[PDB]
C-alpha cells in the first residue's frame, strides 16, 4: 503493497516497509500488507494481490501495531489520524 | 474497534489499545481488532469495518495473547472470564 | 508448506522453517505457511491444506517479515527479488 502519501504516513509515524493492517469499511475485507511511501499528495494506492480486496473509492482504516512491554504500554500514546475524503488531515489525536 | 465495559476489561486485564482476537460463535467469523474502554455497563460494541463481521446479539469470545519466554510460561496464569447474557461476570478462573 | 528452490530462497534470505506470507495475484488468496528448501531448480510447490488456496501456474508474492527495534529499522535494507515466468532471478534490489 500500500502506497501512502509520505506526508500522511509521517503523521501516523509509519515507516516504509512497516507491516500494517488494512480494513475496508465498504466491503469488510481485512488484510495485512506493508507501507510504501508515496510521492503523490493525498494518494492511497493498493498494489499487488490486495487490489482484489478493495475498490477505488472505498473508505479504509490503516492500523499499525507494536509489541510493547508493560512500561512501554503505560507511557505509550497512540497516533490517531483522521482524514477527509481527499485524504487531507482533519485531526491527529494522541488518545482514543 | 471493540468497546468493552472498562470494568469487564479490567477483570480480563485488557489495556486500552491492546490487540485482541474476536471469534463469533454464531457465524464463525474470526478477526483481530483493539480494545477501547467503555463507560457503559455491560456494553460490548463492535466499531468500524468489523461491524460487518457480527450481528448485535451474537455470542463472542474475546482473546488476548502475549509473547512469553519459557520462564514466563511456567509462572503464567491466564485470566479466564465467563459472563452471562448481560455481560455480567459469572466466573473468573486462573486456569483452563 | 511451500517448497522453494533453495537457490531462490537464499537470495531472499529465507531460512528453512521461516514463516512467510503468501499472496496469490490470480485469485487474491492470502495465507501464511513456512519455507521448505527445494532441490529442484525453479521449483515453487505448495504443500498441504494450502494447495486448496492456489492453482498451478498462479503468480504469487512471497513475503518475510521480521520484528525490529528502531535502530534495526534505520539500518535495515529489505531484499526484494523479482523473477521471471520460470522463477529465474531478474532483479534483487535492496530498496523499494
Amino acid at each position: 503493497x500500500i502506497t501512502i502519501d509520505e506526508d500522511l504516513a509521517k503523521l501516523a509515524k509509519l515507516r516504509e516497509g512497516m507491516k500494517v493492517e488494512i480494513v475496508d469499511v465498504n466491503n469488510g475485507e481485512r488484510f495485512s500488507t506493508y507501507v510504501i511511501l508515496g510521492k503523490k499528495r493525498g494518494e492511497i494506492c493498493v498494489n499487488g494481490a490486495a487490489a482484489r480486496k478493495v475498490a477505488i473509492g472505498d473508505v479504509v482504516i490503516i492500523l499499525a501495531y507494536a509489541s510493547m512491554n508493560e512500561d512501554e504500554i503505560n507511557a505509550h500514546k497512540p497516533s490517531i489520524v483522521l482524514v477527509d475524503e481527499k485524504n487531507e488531515i482533519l485531526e491527529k489525536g494522541l488518545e482514543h | 474497534x471493540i468497546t468493552i465495559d472498562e470494568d469487564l476489561a479490567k477483570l480480563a486485564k485488557l489495556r486500552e489499545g491492546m490487540k485482541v482476537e474476536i471469534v463469533d460463535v454464531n457465524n464463525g467469523e474470526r478477526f483481530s481488532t483493539y480494545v477501547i474502554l467503555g463507560k457503559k455497563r455491560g456494553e460490548i460494541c463492535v466499531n468500524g469495518a468489523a461491524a460487518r463481521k457480527v450481528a448485535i446479539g451474537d455470542v463472542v469470545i474475546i482473546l488476548a495473547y502475549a509473547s512469553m519466554n519459557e520462564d514466563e510460561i511456567n509462572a503464567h496464569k491466564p485470566s479466564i472470564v465467563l459472563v452471562d447474557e448481560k455481560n455480567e461476570i459469572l466466573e473468573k478462573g486462573l486456569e483452563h | 508448506x511451500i517448497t522453494i528452490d533453495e537457490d531462490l530462497a537464499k537470495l531472499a534470505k529465507l531460512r528453512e522453517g521461516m514463516k512467510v506470507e503468501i499472496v496469490d495475484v490470480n485469485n487474491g488468496e492470502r495465507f501464511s505457511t513456512y519455507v521448505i528448501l527445494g532441490k529442484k531448480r525453479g521449483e515453487i510447490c505448495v504443500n498441504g491444506a494450502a494447495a486448496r488456496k492456489v492453482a498451478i501456474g498462479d503468480v504469487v508474492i512471497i513475503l518475510a517479515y521480521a520484528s525490529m527495534n528502531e535502530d534495526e529499522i534505520n539500518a535495515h535494507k529489505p531484499s526484494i527479488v523479482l523473477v521471471d515466468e520460470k522463477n529465474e532471478i531478474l532483479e534483487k534490489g535492496l530498496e523499494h
Binding site: 510504501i36 498494489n47 473508505v59 482504516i61 509489541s67 510493547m68 490517531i80 483522521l82 | 509473547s67 | -
Partner: peptide, 24 residues
C-alpha cells in the same frame, strides 16, 4: 512479556488507486 498494542492508525482514508500487477 510483550503485547501487540495499537501504535497508530489512519482513520477512514480513501483508496485513490489500485494496481493488481504492480512491480516493485
Amino acid at each position: 512479556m510483550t503485547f501487540e498494542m495499537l501504535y497508530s492508525k489512519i482513520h477512514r482514508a480513501t483508496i485513490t488507486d489500485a494496481n493488481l500487477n504492480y512491480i516493485g
